[PDB]
Amino acid sequence: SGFRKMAFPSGKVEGCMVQVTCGTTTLNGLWLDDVVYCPRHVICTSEDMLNPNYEDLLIRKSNHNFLVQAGNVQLRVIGHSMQNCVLKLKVDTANPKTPKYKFVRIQPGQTFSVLACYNGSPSGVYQCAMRPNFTIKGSFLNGSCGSVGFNIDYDCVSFCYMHHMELPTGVHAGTDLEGNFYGPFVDRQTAQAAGTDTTITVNVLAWLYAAVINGDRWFLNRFTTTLNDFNLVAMKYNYEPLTQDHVDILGPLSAQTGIAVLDMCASLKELLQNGMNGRTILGSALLEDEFTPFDVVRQCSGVTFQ
């Protein structure tokens, strides 16, 4: 029993974190095999930020303008290349701590663990979701660029996020590990703003199923809804459209609880209309949308508390 924002154990990723310095700019890198990955804005200067020409900035660098430090050991850079918004530094030693890993670009609504790091050293670990507007609501201070997000289903690390920027609203933007930004953002300090964000509907339904699995049914009702009518209502509360894909993805939780997906949709409609009237759901007074269906099956018992 219980239900918390549960991150993956971070040790497999801690063993990959290094410090990268170019000029007076220092941030984090990710050391996998004999390559160190980091944001390309490590090569920018304080004046370079509005409209940097990264190709022109990079050709002026030699391998030895990059200082990479793994703990108290300096790594020797023997090559460098730019891939989209990520810099790839080839080093003379493979990381002996490299886990099994892959790179995956995730969809809005997917969740992942973030290992926040400063000067190549880890500070803390927490769960995040890719918002519908392609930002993440992280906890990052100056020096955190190069921190990564990941999942570790099975024993394989799936790297999905590298942190590049904090936006004026206080949310965060970054890339996959191929250097392609999530969303419309670009790595320069020009005015940019994330779109209006929405609530991840499939995730709220997953979390309501978690509540039922753990023994709570007070919010259910005797009604149902069509998918079309549910989306018509949900849209008025700034919820994302629920698709047939999402209904399919919720199938396992529906099967375990005996609650048809569209019947849980009717419960959500009523919660949006009524509020919680002093009650809570899994400890929250607001509807939670950063647990995916997969996250719920990962954490909850396979046996409903009936």
Ligand X SMILES: CCCOc1cc(Cl)cc(-c2cc(-c3ccccc3C#N)cn(-c3cccnc3)c2=O)c1
Cβ atoms 38, 26 nearer than 8 A: no
Task: State the residue for tokens 């080839």.
Answer: 90
Based on the residue annotation, tell me whether 246 is a catalytic residue of this protein: no
Cβ atoms 83, 179 nearer than 8 A: yes
Choice among 85, 128, 145, 300 that is catalytic:
145
**Binds its own copies (CB under 8 A): choice among 23, 143, 183, 241:** 143
Backbone phi, then psi, for 262, in 5-degree steps? Answer: -65, -25
- Binders of ligand X among 49-88, rule CB under 6 A? 49
**Binds its own copies (CB under 8 A): choice among 5, 61, 105, 188:** 5
For ligand X (CB under 6 A), the number of binding residues is 17
Q: Residue 49's binding partner, choosing from its own copies, ligand X, none, with beta-carbon cut-off 5 to 8 A by kind?
A: ligand X
Part of the chain binding its own copies (CB under 8 A), chosen from 121-129, 193-201, 217-225, 253-261: 121-129
The angle at the Cα of 224, spanning 222 to 227, to the nearest 5 degrees, equals: 165
Q: Is 119 in the site for ligand X (CB under 6 A)?
A: no
Q: Is 14 in the site for its own copies (CB under 8 A)?
A: yes
Based on the residue annotation, tell me whether 41 is a catalytic residue of this protein: yes
Q: Is 118 in the site for its own copies (CB under 8 A)?
A: yes
Q: Is 131 in the site for ligand X (CB under 6 A)?
A: no
CA distance 223 to 132: 29
Q: Residue 296's binding partner, choosing from its own copies, ligand X, none, with beta-carbon cut-off 5 to 8 A by kind?
A: none
Cβ atoms 234, 268 nearer than 8 A: yes
| 61-100 footprint of its own copies as x/- string (CB under 8 A) | ----------------------------------------
- Min dist CB 165 to ligand X, Å, is 4
Task: State the residue for tokens 């259910």.
Answer: 220
CA distance 244 to 265: 13
Choice among 16, 22, 41, 85 that is catalytic:
41
- Cβ closest to its own copies, residue 3 vs residue 219: 3
- Mark 72-94 as b/e (b = at least 16 C-beta within 10 Å): eeebebeebeeeebbbbbebeee
Task: State the residue for tokens 């069509």.
Answer: 226
Part of the chain binding ligand X (CB under 6 A), chosen from 29-37, 164-172, 174-182, 226-234: 164-172
**Binds its own copies (CB under 8 A): choice among 50, 156, 235, 285:** 285
CA distance 269 to 201: 11
CA distance 171 to 140: 9
Q: Is 27 in the site for ligand X (CB under 6 A)?
A: yes
**Binds its own copies (CB under 8 A): choice among 12, 41, 164, 246:** 12
**Binds its own copies (CB under 8 A): choice among 69, 98, 199, 304:** 304
CA distance 43 to 21: 9
- The two structure tokens encoding residue 78: 């023997």
Q: Is 144 in the site for ligand X (CB under 6 A)?
A: yes
Task: State the residue for tokens 């709220």.
Answer: 204
Q: Residue 145's binding partner, choosing from ligand X, its own copies, none, with beta-carbon cut-off 5 to 8 A by kind?
A: ligand X
Q: Residue type at 110?
A: Q
The H-or-E segment that residue 233 falls in is: helix 227-235
- The binding site for ligand X (CB under 6 A) comprises 25, 27, 41, 49, 140-145, 165-167, 187-189, 192
- Report, as residue numbers or ranges, the catalytic residues: 41, 145
